[PDB]
Amino acid sequence: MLSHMVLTRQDIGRAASFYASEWQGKGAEELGLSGEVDSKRFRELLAGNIGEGHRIMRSATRQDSKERIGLDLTFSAPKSVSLQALVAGDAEIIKAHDRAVARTLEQAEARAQARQKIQGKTRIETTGNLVIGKFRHETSRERDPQLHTHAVILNMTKRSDGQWRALKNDEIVKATRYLGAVYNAELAHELQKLGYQLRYGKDGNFDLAHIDRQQIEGFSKRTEQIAEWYAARGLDPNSVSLEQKQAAKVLSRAKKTSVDREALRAEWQATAKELGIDFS
DNA sequence: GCACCGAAAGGTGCGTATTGTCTA
C-alpha cells in the first residue's frame, strides 16, 4: 500500500516524531546526507533551512495559505509480510521491504519538478532530484504488527540553474497508484527470491501463500474498525466520497498507551499460535 | 493560472489523491 499526505507547518512536531532511519535522494547525496537521519538536520530541512550558504527557503508563501514542510509517502507491506517479518522475526523480509521502498522512491524522484519564471513567463522543469528521510515503523494504532515506512519527501529540489526551490509535487502526487504497483512488484520479486510462494488478490496485491485470510484477519483490527464504521453509517464499502473515506479512517480510532515492546511481540507470537499460523 | 508573497518584471500554495494491511 502506498498512501500520501501533504505535510504542513502545523505538522512540524508529528513529522519530526517520525524519527531504522535512512536518507535517500540525489538531492540528499549532493548535500552530503547519507546514512542514518540526524534529527536536528531533519528538523532544519523541515523548516526550509537547507543551510550551507543558502537563504531560508519558501518565503514567497502567501500568509493566507499554509506553508508546506514536505510530502509523506507511506509504504505498507501486506499483512502476511508484516507477520513473517515482525512476529516470526525475519531480517531478510525487512530488507526486502527496504529495497522495494528504495526502488519505488527512485521512480518518485524521477518525477520531481519545479517552476521557473522568466519575465512573467512560467515554465515547468523536471529536476529529477529529492531529499527524503525514511523512517521504518512496525505497529498500527491498534498495536497489530504492521511493517511500514514513512518516506518524508522534503519540500525542496534543485533546478537546472542550480537553485533550490520548493518541489512541484503534481507528478508524484498523481502517480500514487502507479508507485503503489511498483512497490508491490518489487516486494513480490524480492520475496520470490527468498523462496516464498505467493497468493494473488485482485489489484496486484498479494500475500504469502502459507498464511491464509482468517489468519490475516486476526491481526487486522484497524480494518475491522473501518468496516464497522461503514456498516453503522449505512454507507457501502464500494462507493464512498473522499470526505467519507477519510472520515471512517480517522473517526473510528480509539486511544492507546506506551506498549511494552518486548511483551508485545510475545503477545503476537501467542496470537499467531492461536490462529494456527505456520511460519514454516 | 491565479493572487498574494517579498521586493527577483521572481516564487509560493492552491488542488492533486489515497487499493488495504489502514499509515501519515
Tell me which nucleotides of strand B come within 7 A of a protein CB.
1-24
Dig out the grid coordinates for A273 from the structure.
499460535
- In chain A, residues 157 through 176 whose Cβ sits under 7 angstroms from any atom of nucleic acid strand B: 163, 165-166, 168-170, 173-174, 176
Q: How far is the CA of A204 from the C1' of B1 (A)?
A: 37
Please check if A150 is assigned to a binding site: yes
For nucleotide B20, the protein residue with its alpha carbon nearest to C1' is A1
Cβ A45 vs Cβ A37: under 8 Å: no
In terms of C-beta density within 10 A (0-12 exposed, 13-18 middle, 19 or more buried), how is residue A187 classed?
A: buried
User: Using CA atoms, how far apart are residues A232 and A236, in angstroms rounded to an integer?
Assistant: 10
Q: What is the resolution of this structure in A?
A: 2.7
Q: Quick one: cell of A239?
A: 462507493
Query: What is the number of other CB atoms lying within 10 angstroms of the CB of residue A95?
Result: 13
How far apart CA A57 and CA A73 sit, in angstroms, is 22
Closest CA to A75 of A147, A175, A153, A19: A147
CA dist A26 → A136, A212, A247 (Å)? 20, 40, 37
- CB A31: neighbour CB atoms within 10 A? 19
Q: Is the Cβ–Cβ distance between A256 and A280 less than 8 Å?
A: no
Q: Which residues of A196-235 are buried (b: 16+ CB within 10 A; e: fewer)?
A: bebeeeeeeebbbebbeeebbebbbebeebbeebbeeeeb
Question: Where are chain A's structural domains?
Answer: 2-280
Instruction: Pull the grid cell for residue A157.
Output: 529540489
